[PDB]
Amino acid sequence: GLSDGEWQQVLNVWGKVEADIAGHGQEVLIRLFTGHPETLEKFDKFKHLKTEAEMKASEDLKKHGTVVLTALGGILKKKGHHEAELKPLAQSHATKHKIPIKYLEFISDAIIHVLHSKHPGDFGADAQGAMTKALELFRNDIAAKYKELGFQ
Numbered sequence: 001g002l003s004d005g006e007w008q009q010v011l012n013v014w015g016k017v018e019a020d021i022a023g024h025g026q027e028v029l030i031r032l033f034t035g036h037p038e039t040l041e042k043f044d045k046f047k048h049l050k051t052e053a054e055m056k057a058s059e060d061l062k063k064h065g066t067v068v069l070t071a072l073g074g075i076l077k078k079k080g081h082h083e084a085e086l087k088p089l090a091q092s093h094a095t096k097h098k099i100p101i102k103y104l105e106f107i108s109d110a111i112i113h114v115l116h117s118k119h120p121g122d123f124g125a126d127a128q129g130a131m132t133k134a135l136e137l138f139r140n141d142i143a144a145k146y147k148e149l150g151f152q
């Protein structure tokens with residue numbers, strides 16, 4: 001649950017992402033894959049990537065980064081009223097991709113890391129607080145659907 005002022009911070013930060021969605025999406029996935037190499041094994045189309053240089057050179061990884069952040073941005077713009085947008089993603093990630101909630105924690109922290117890396121000194125403590133709360137809400141509502149499905 002976020003206040004109006006917190007949502008305003010989230011959507012202000014998101015403007016930074018929308019200026020370069022592919023570059024942000026690429027770096028988020030690279031941070032996930034290099035920090036948590038077990039996550040790469042869930043992607044049949046990226047498991048061939050052995051080095052970060054190959055990851056950086058992969059145009060399909062940048063494409064998928066655009067898909068991921070476009071979906072997340074659509075959810076964030078609903079300011080919590082995201083049941084219709086979130087349900088299909090919860091279902092596909094639990095039942096088809098088999099993504100444990102832990103990996104959603106990993107990618108949430110990766111987003112925070114990338115924002116500081118690309119905007120050092122321009123991602124203030126209030127903005128980090130609000131973005132963190134928004135990603136916690138996203139993860140918590142996914143977790144509720146995971147529990148319904150019995151997925152661990």
Ligand code: HEM
Binds near residue numbers: 043088092099
């Ligand atoms: C912010 C969190 C995430 C968002 C918004 C997101 C979004 C998406 C979307 C929109 C798709 C394509 C449609 C679909 O299959 O539902 C997708 C596919 C997929 N996601 Fe995610 N995802 C997220 C996190 C993760 C994480 C953490 C993992 C694994 C560590 C993951 C694994 C996958 C896989 C394996 C696919 C299929 C890729 C393919 O072969 O095309 N997702 N995701």
